[PDB]
């Protein structure tokens, strides 16, 4: 919006075509990661870590 | 049998002893029962309920 447009203008941030959906740890709960699994649809290229 | 097993123990039959408040260090009138009870943790644990 107008005032939002000015806000990016002063502080010079490029507002992304992408929004953050990232999975983050629930509030207050804290622990150690003992494992990670990666499932992929058949045909999408598996990324590096996976 | 319990009293007999308490006899081998060196511990009194009443199953009660003198106990002292850790605060004032004073004694407690009357003997109190002290012993070993098996105790469970049910899983209601509070940082679920809150």
């Amino acid at each position: 919006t107008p005032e939002e447009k000015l806000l990016r203008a002063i502080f010079g941030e490029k507002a992304s075509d992408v929004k953050d959906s990232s999975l983050r740890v629930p509030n207050g709960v804290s622990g150690t990661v003992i494992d990670v699994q990666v499932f992929t649809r058949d045909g999408v290229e598996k990324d590096k870590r996976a | 049998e319990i009293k007999e097993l308490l006899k081998l123990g060196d511990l009194p039959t009443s199953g009660q002893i003198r106990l002292y408040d850790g605060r004032t260090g004073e004694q407690f009138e009357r003997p109190v029962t002290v012993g070993y009870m098996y105790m469970l943790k049910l899983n209601h644990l509070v940082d679920d309920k809150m």
Binding site: - | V46, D47, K49, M50
Partner: protein
């Protein structure tokens, strides 16, 4: 962020500001009663025995 300063602020907004406490089968009107909050470490509600 839970900056240290807010806890003191919470003590201000809490002071005179009652909260309603309620238990499950509300029967008579006493099933809901108001109390003044006292900040407590821990996840449990502490409740005056006489009540």
């Amino acid at each position: 962020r839970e900056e240290a300063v807010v806890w003191d602020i919470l003590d201000e907004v809490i002071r005179e500001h009652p909260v309603l406490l309620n238990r499950a089968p509300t029967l008579h009107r006493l099933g809901i009663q108001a109390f003044e909050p006292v900040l407590i470490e821990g996840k449990a509600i502490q409740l005056h025995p006489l009540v």
